[PDB]
Write an enzyme that holds these catalytic residues in place. Structure first.
Site, PDB file in Angstrom:
ATOM      1  N   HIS A  62       0.807  -1.211   0.000  1.00  0.00           N
ATOM      2  CA  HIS A  62       0.000   0.000   0.000  1.00  0.00           C
ATOM      3  C   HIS A  62       0.832   1.249   0.000  1.00  0.00           C
ATOM      4  O   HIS A  62       0.395   2.267  -0.596  1.00  0.00           O
ATOM      5  CB  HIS A  62      -1.088   0.047   1.079  1.00  0.00           C
ATOM      6  CG  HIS A  62      -0.656  -0.374   2.446  1.00  0.00           C
ATOM      7  ND1 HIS A  62      -0.261   0.523   3.418  1.00  0.00           N
ATOM      8  CD2 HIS A  62      -0.614  -1.600   3.025  1.00  0.00           C
ATOM      9  CE1 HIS A  62      -0.002  -0.130   4.536  1.00  0.00           C
ATOM     10  NE2 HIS A  62      -0.189  -1.422   4.317  1.00  0.00           N
ATOM     11  N   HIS A  92       6.364   6.855   6.071  1.00  0.00           N
ATOM     12  CA  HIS A  92       5.887   6.440   4.756  1.00  0.00           C
ATOM     13  C   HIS A  92       5.225   7.695   4.169  1.00  0.00           C
ATOM     14  O   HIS A  92       5.045   8.711   4.827  1.00  0.00           O
ATOM     15  CB  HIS A  92       4.888   5.257   4.855  1.00  0.00           C
ATOM     16  CG  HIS A  92       3.666   5.627   5.661  1.00  0.00           C
ATOM     17  ND1 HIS A  92       3.576   5.522   7.042  1.00  0.00           N
ATOM     18  CD2 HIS A  92       2.514   6.230   5.261  1.00  0.00           C
ATOM     19  CE1 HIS A  92       2.400   6.009   7.446  1.00  0.00           C
ATOM     20  NE2 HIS A  92       1.737   6.440   6.376  1.00  0.00           N
ATOM     21  N   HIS A  94       1.974   9.130   1.240  1.00  0.00           N
ATOM     22  CA  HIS A  94       0.812   8.932   0.370  1.00  0.00           C
ATOM     23  C   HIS A  94       0.967   9.908  -0.780  1.00  0.00           C
ATOM     24  O   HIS A  94       1.434  11.003  -0.579  1.00  0.00           O
ATOM     25  CB  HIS A  94      -0.490   9.250   1.155  1.00  0.00           C
ATOM     26  CG  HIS A  94      -0.655   8.461   2.432  1.00  0.00           C
ATOM     27  ND1 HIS A  94      -1.447   7.326   2.513  1.00  0.00           N
ATOM     28  CD2 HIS A  94      -0.053   8.585   3.657  1.00  0.00           C
ATOM     29  CE1 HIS A  94      -1.317   6.794   3.729  1.00  0.00           C
ATOM     30  NE2 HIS A  94      -0.516   7.562   4.458  1.00  0.00           N
ATOM     31  N   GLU A 104      -3.425  13.423   2.097  1.00  0.00           N
ATOM     32  CA  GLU A 104      -4.571  12.908   2.820  1.00  0.00           C
ATOM     33  C   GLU A 104      -5.244  14.107   3.524  1.00  0.00           C
ATOM     34  O   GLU A 104      -6.429  14.344   3.306  1.00  0.00           O
ATOM     35  CB  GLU A 104      -4.061  11.905   3.850  1.00  0.00           C
ATOM     36  CG  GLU A 104      -3.533  10.664   3.105  1.00  0.00           C
ATOM     37  CD  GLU A 104      -3.731   9.361   3.877  1.00  0.00           C
ATOM     38  OE1 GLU A 104      -3.256   9.271   5.019  1.00  0.00           O
ATOM     39  OE2 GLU A 104      -4.390   8.439   3.349  1.00  0.00           O
ATOM     40  N   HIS A 117       4.242  10.836   6.519  1.00  0.00           N
ATOM     41  CA  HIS A 117       3.730  10.515   7.893  1.00  0.00           C
ATOM     42  C   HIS A 117       4.844   9.903   8.638  1.00  0.00           C
ATOM     43  O   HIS A 117       5.328   8.801   8.267  1.00  0.00           O
ATOM     44  CB  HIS A 117       2.579   9.499   7.851  1.00  0.00           C
ATOM     45  CG  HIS A 117       1.343  10.133   7.308  1.00  0.00           C
ATOM     46  ND1 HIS A 117       0.261   9.418   6.785  1.00  0.00           N
ATOM     47  CD2 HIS A 117       1.025  11.460   7.179  1.00  0.00           C
ATOM     48  CE1 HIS A 117      -0.676  10.288   6.412  1.00  0.00           C
ATOM     49  NE2 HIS A 117      -0.246  11.519   6.649  1.00  0.00           N
ATOM     50  N   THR A 196      -5.059   6.278   9.079  1.00  0.00           N
ATOM     51  CA  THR A 196      -5.775   6.551   7.803  1.00  0.00           C
ATOM     52  C   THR A 196      -5.870   5.303   6.916  1.00  0.00           C
ATOM     53  O   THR A 196      -6.366   5.381   5.779  1.00  0.00           O
ATOM     54  CB  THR A 196      -5.103   7.707   6.988  1.00  0.00           C
ATOM     55  OG1 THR A 196      -3.830   7.256   6.512  1.00  0.00           O
ATOM     56  CG2 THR A 196      -5.049   8.970   7.915  1.00  0.00           C
ATOM     57  N   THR A 197      -5.339   4.183   7.361  1.00  0.00           N
ATOM     58  CA  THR A 197      -5.545   2.903   6.654  1.00  0.00           C
ATOM     59  C   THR A 197      -6.164   1.916   7.635  1.00  0.00           C
ATOM     60  O   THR A 197      -5.923   2.016   8.874  1.00  0.00           O
ATOM     61  CB  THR A 197      -4.182   2.333   6.094  1.00  0.00           C
ATOM     62  OG1 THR A 197      -3.202   2.309   7.150  1.00  0.00           O
ATOM     63  CG2 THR A 197      -3.673   3.188   4.920  1.00  0.00           C
TER      64      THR A 197
HETATM   65  N1  LIG Z   1      -1.351   6.479   7.556  1.00  0.00           N
HETATM   66  S1  LIG Z   1      -1.099   6.612   9.117  1.00  0.00           S
HETATM   67  O1  LIG Z   1      -2.301   7.061   9.756  1.00  0.00           O
HETATM   68  O2  LIG Z   1       0.119   7.346   9.465  1.00  0.00           O
HETATM   69  C1  LIG Z   1      -0.821   5.050   9.680  1.00  0.00           C
HETATM   70  C2  LIG Z   1       0.290   4.722  10.526  1.00  0.00           C
HETATM   71  C3  LIG Z   1       0.551   3.463  11.088  1.00  0.00           C
HETATM   72  C4  LIG Z   1      -0.305   2.426  10.695  1.00  0.00           C
HETATM   73  C5  LIG Z   1      -0.072   1.028  11.162  1.00  0.00           C
HETATM   74  O3  LIG Z   1       0.845   0.819  11.947  1.00  0.00           O
HETATM   75  N2  LIG Z   1      -0.815   0.009  10.704  1.00  0.00           N
HETATM   76  C6  LIG Z   1      -0.539  -1.334  11.152  1.00  0.00           C
HETATM   77  C7  LIG Z   1      -1.811  -1.671  11.936  1.00  0.00           C
HETATM   78  F1  LIG Z   1      -2.436  -0.670  12.588  1.00  0.00           F
HETATM   79  F2  LIG Z   1      -2.451  -2.224  10.907  1.00  0.00           F
HETATM   80  C8  LIG Z   1      -1.450  -2.457  13.150  1.00  0.00           C
HETATM   81  F3  LIG Z   1      -2.472  -2.763  13.954  1.00  0.00           F
HETATM   82  F4  LIG Z   1      -0.802  -1.450  13.740  1.00  0.00           F
HETATM   83  F5  LIG Z   1      -0.807  -3.555  12.698  1.00  0.00           F
HETATM   84  C9  LIG Z   1      -1.367   2.695   9.802  1.00  0.00           C
HETATM   85  C10 LIG Z   1      -1.684   3.973   9.338  1.00  0.00           C
HETATM   86 ZN   LIG Z   2       0.038   7.461   6.424  1.00  0.00          ZN
END
Ligand SMILES: NS(=O)(=O)c1ccc(C(=O)NCC(F)(F)C(F)(F)F)cc1
Ligand SMILES: [Zn+2]
Length: 258
Positions: A62, A92, A94, A104, A117, A196-197
């Protein structure tokens, strides 16, 4: 199939597996500058990245993540709206298929070409997995990218992208200094929001810098050559990996500056 950014699996579909998608503190949001309240009680952010230890860069299908050693208080974010010490774990971006879209957060409905981010977790929670389950578990520093002059501190990232073209590829990425991705000013806006994901957890204190950084069209072009798919699968360019603005609801965006 899982979640993604296509018509079939994109942000409009996420709520079916992640009902928190329609929650009360979802991110990103539009930052209306006429409505964000200056808060002279906010402190200066403290960004201590001098002892940052980058390890690895990974295409996760992603985005790509530059990951850091977070097993001690090396690279930390403190101050501003935060209580305590948040450790940098990864950054990372976007970005869009075109320069007029990609961020975003938006500012007065203005979209930037990309958004960085820098993701940090609250050390009072012991590990990142515990932190994302708490309303104050993460702090993400968001920085807008506009297309202009090259960012020299970004070039080491753009040059390694050819080595992680497809989903699940990684490369060693040591000695990368994230200070080279910061703008001059640390003035910011702040609000309580979410990842945000998926899984869209509502665990994030957003700190979004007012001053964008400038990157060259050649540098952002390189982002857009990455692939969502794994090696040998049908090529799908990694572009437009941004969630649209979510309603602000019962929240206030504060400004650090007048
Ligand atoms: N785009 S953001 O808002 O900066 C953003 C930053 C970090 C994560 C993230 O660690 N996803 C991994 C996860 F949450 F799926 C887990 F539970 F942590 F494994 C996602 C979005
Ligand atoms: Zn992000």
């Amino acid at each position: 199939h899982h979640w993604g950014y296509g018509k079939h699996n994109g942000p409009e579909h996420w709520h079916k597996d992640f009902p928190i998608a329609k929650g009360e503190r979802q991110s990103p949001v539009d930052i209306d500058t006429h409505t964000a309240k200056y808060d002279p009680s906010l402190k200066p952010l403290s960004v201590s990245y001098d002892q940052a230890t980058s390890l690895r860069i990974l295409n996760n299908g992603h985005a790509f993540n530059v990951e850091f050693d977070d097993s001690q208080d090396k690279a930390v974010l403190k101050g501003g709206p935060l209580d305590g010490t948040y450790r940098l774990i990864q950054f990372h971006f976007h970005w869009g298929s075109l320069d007029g879209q990609g961020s975003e957060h938006t500012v007065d409905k203005k979209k930037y070409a990309a958004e960085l981010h820098l993701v940090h977790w609250n050390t009072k929670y012991g590990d990142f997995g515990k932190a994302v389950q708490q309303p104050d578990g993460l702090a993400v520093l968001g920085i807008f990218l506009k297309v202009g002059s090259a960012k020299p501190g970004l070039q080491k990232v753009v040059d390694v992208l050819d080595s992680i073209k497809t989903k699940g590829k990684s490369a060693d990425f040591t000695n990368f200094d994230p200070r080279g991705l910061l703008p001059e000013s640390l003035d910011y806006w702040t609000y309580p929001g979410s990842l945000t994901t998926p899984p869209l957890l509502e665990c994030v204190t957003w700190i979004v810098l007012k001053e964008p950084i400038s990157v060259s069209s050649e540098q952002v072009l390189k982002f857009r050559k990455l692939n969502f798919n794994g090696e040998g699968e049908p090529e799908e360019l990694m572009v437009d990996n941004w969630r649209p603005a979510q309603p602000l609801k019962n929240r206030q965006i504060k400004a650090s500056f007048k």
